[PDB]
Symmetry: D2
Subunit: 244 residues, 4 copies
């Protein structure tokens, strides 16, 4: 029997936020394809999802890989009808020490990848007259952070891209939205001290760090029928760290 | 039994959809109408999972009597949805003091009054949801609606201040800003090329009132089909 | 000889920001009417402005006073063509201790006064096909501050009011804008300790408290021909305390 | 002598108005064009109060040569106005990699590159103005402009980050977002019921580059006639 569930593609699904998003979309009833940067990582995803998802190796910096991955999904599982752009890294530096590579690599991994993957999935969504593109942004696209001019520019760019695309695709009942996490407990915050986590949580109105599941819950909502009249927005999930 | 939600203006439209959805979600819903007859209709619709009460949100005495009644009979209000409203549009040159004041009182003052009155129960519970219905026109301005736009924008700023005050007690305070909701030129302005339905707003309120939105506070959730985008 | 300069009305011009705005608009060439809450305060303003302005007593809570003041200006100096809504106070309290009076008095002094004064001056601006309404808002209408739910609601309301009015009056070449100060050195910050002023200035990107003249400079710009294509905006003057 | 301003794309339109205004304000203005012929025309327009240089902001080598030349011959760049730009609009389905990349490079990458290159002189002076020309469409979205809107929104966020980095040295970093500027259906969307002129933008840049805006940093100054309001 053929794969019959709607297909979601979640980039960077190995851990933390990406992993929680992938698992929640599986629980919601999607067939989930998740990506990792290595075959070994991809195989781990495959095993975690069991027979309701697949893991694929992908470096989102490369158009040929993006095209190959989506073609593979279309040929084996179905058209990508939910796209979650989550994969990313940071290369922080004050501008006076921010190299051409530091800049280009971050813009390519974040903003260029959103452009490339969004463009590649539009045809299938158009034919379906259904689609969800959900981009993971950051509180830092709103609240200024020194040392992250590259990351902030990319994430803000993604939000503006999302608005333009939402206008273009709305008549096909495709929604395009962003989710902007605040302080979410991840590998990186785990590496910080208890004292610094307390300083962080004191700035959050809710007085605690969030969890990957909080971001998964937002993505889940946006990907659902409960959010069909929401498009071109940023859904802030930061515990009142930043309010708009 | 269940946690109690209070939904103001639950007789029809958006409020009715919200009240019915929160019932389906598992809340005991107290819905309000401006008449005793409207309040009875709600009691009859909700049956065992809710109650109807008459309330004019312009009046502090009624607000205090209504919440007291709920506390005596059903339990503390742990989800407050401030939805009751009207419009009295006019270009500023034709906008009377009464038209200004009545809109500010029904929308913004009521949010201040009801929010203040429910804080103690939420604080004791270390749980709460205050969900205020705003509007797209608090962002995308419309001539003739200076009173309504001022009130809804006020509500949003109120909500941010209160979110900061109450967050440590795990009370979230948020706004939902509907676009054009059906109660051709309009739907052409919307990216999705259709008007919204009350259920679209109920769905957003339902999300916010749930554990799925436990880390969301002080925000505006825009439900407008791409009529206005941030 | 009759009063020939364009007339500006600046509410609460006794000190700090209001005083600096009034004096700058005089330097710009306006005839400035400033207000104070007492006759004694009004007389001080009269003397400070010399023969290029007037002081009038006004409590902006009262419609009859607002109407009387503007009528007086029209009968003696000219139509109000620049309106600067600056007068105000705070009555801070956490919501559980914020009384009906605390709420009503702040909404009336800030938002109702803007509505009342704006409405009262429109006819003269309409006839002139020139007008500037400039409302003094606050960073707190944007950046959440506990204890100021009344003040934040009023200032945010003023900004939304300004947008609606800007749409209504734009075809008459009347602009309606707000200026949102951050940490400005005033009587109130003078009353704080050196330590607390240092904590404040550490949060400002420019690493210092602003001065009343910084707000006057913004108001001056908006009231000028250099800002004739700017309407319905908030001009933030906070040294990068809050960025949008 | 005077403080040096660099204005990219000063040949015509908004950039030309900015360059002429900054001259009137008292800056020595270095303006740029994409050709040697265009650069000569600027040198001739500016006379004693400015110079023209050829620059394609897509190229890092040219950016570095241009600023070095200015530093050798005129003084450190203390006011940088990033204005040079083009559009390559298309619906996303027809937007090629080249059309994406070229817009990102000319707009956003150039702002990164030029800002980085001028920091040292501004830091030494403990004075600086970086003024980036954005656009209303970074806020009020337009179909067909996903590349341009992404770049301009990126520029604004870049500007906020840099404003935080450089503020202690009294360097301000701000964006000016023009609406429809003339270079009927359009002017009906504008509250002021007319298109803007290049001078409206020059006036806003002039304000920001002056001591009258010494406490303004990390902001967007909207100059759009009420086409889009915050
Ligand atoms: N954590 C937070 O608090 C926070 C706050 C704001 C925004 N965000 C955003 O939320 C998203 C999740 O971030 P995170 O902190 O959870 O990340 P993370 O735990 O570090 O995970 C990174 C993921 O992205 C993948 N990845 C890295 N480089 C890649 C490339 N070139 N191509 C394809 N995939 C690549 C990684 O693959 P491998 O595992 O195979 O290396 C991994 O799955 C990001 O977009 C981030 O910017 C997070
Ligand atoms: N519809 C839209 O497109 C739209 C867009 C943006 C925002 N909103 C907001 O959504 C909310 C609901 O709007 P709607 O379109 O559903 O309105 P609606 O269909 O006219 O319903 C109004 C409700 O409020 C109640 N109400 C009116 N005045 C009241 C008072 N003084 N005290 C107590 N209750 C009162 C009414 O009670 P009775 O039935 O007893 O009269 C009714 O239940 C409002 O806050 C509105 O501003 C709506
Ligand atoms: N200072 C800051 O850092 C800051 C920050 C954000 C926003 N703001 C805003 O900027 C404006 C200036 O504030 P400020 O702190 O400079 O004020 P301030 O120095 O305390 O001056 C208050 C002024 O308003 C007048 N006033 C008070 N109550 C009045 C009433 N009922 N009717 C008429 N006039 C009245 C006072 O008159 P008398 O002198 O006769 O009493 C005085 O001239 C205000 O709107 C404020 O909300 C200031
Ligand atoms: N016009 C509007 O309504 C509007 C609205 C929003 C934003 N803006 C922004 O305002 C800025 C100026 O726009 P405009 O309307 O004045 O444009 P314009 O009249 O077409 O002028 C463009 C300028 O940029 C230069 N330029 C183009 N490509 C370049 C490159 N690769 N390297 C260096 N310089 C280059 C041109 O030089 P040559 O003369 O040598 O070709 C010219 O001086 C742009 O950033 C634009 O995005 C304009």
């Amino acid at each position: 029997m053929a794969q019959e569930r709607k297909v979601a593609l979640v980039t960077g699904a190995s851990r933390g936020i990406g992993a929680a998003i992938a698992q929640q979309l599986i629980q919601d009833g999607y067939f989930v394809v998740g990506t990792a940067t290595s075959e070994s990582g991809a195989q781990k995803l495959t095993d975690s999802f069991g027979e309701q998802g697949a893991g694929l190796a992908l470096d989102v910096r490369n158009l040929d890989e993006i095209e190959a991955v989506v073609s593979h999904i279309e040929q084996n599982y179905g058209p990508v009808l939910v796209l979650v752009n989550n994969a990313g890294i940071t290369k922080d530096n004050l501008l006076l020490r921010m190299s051409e590579d530091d800049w280009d690599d971050i813009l390519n991994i974040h903003l260029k990848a959103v452009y490339r993957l969004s463009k590649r999935v539009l045809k299938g969504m158009t034919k379906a007259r259904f689609g969800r593109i959900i981009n993971i942004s950051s509180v830092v696209a709103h609240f200024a952070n020194p040392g992250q001019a590259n990351y902030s520019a990319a994430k803000a760019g993604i939000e503006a891209f999302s608005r333009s695309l939402a206008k273009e695709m709305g008549s096909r009942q495709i929604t395009v939205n962003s989710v902007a996490p605040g302080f979410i407990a991840t590998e990186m915050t785990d590496a910080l001290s208890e004292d610094i986590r307390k300083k962080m949580s004191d700035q959050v109105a809710l007085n605690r760090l969030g969890e990957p599941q909080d971001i998964a819950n937002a993505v889940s909502f946006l990907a659902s029928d409960k959010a069909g009249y929401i498009t071109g927005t940023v859904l802030h999930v930061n515990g009142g760290l930043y309010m708009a």
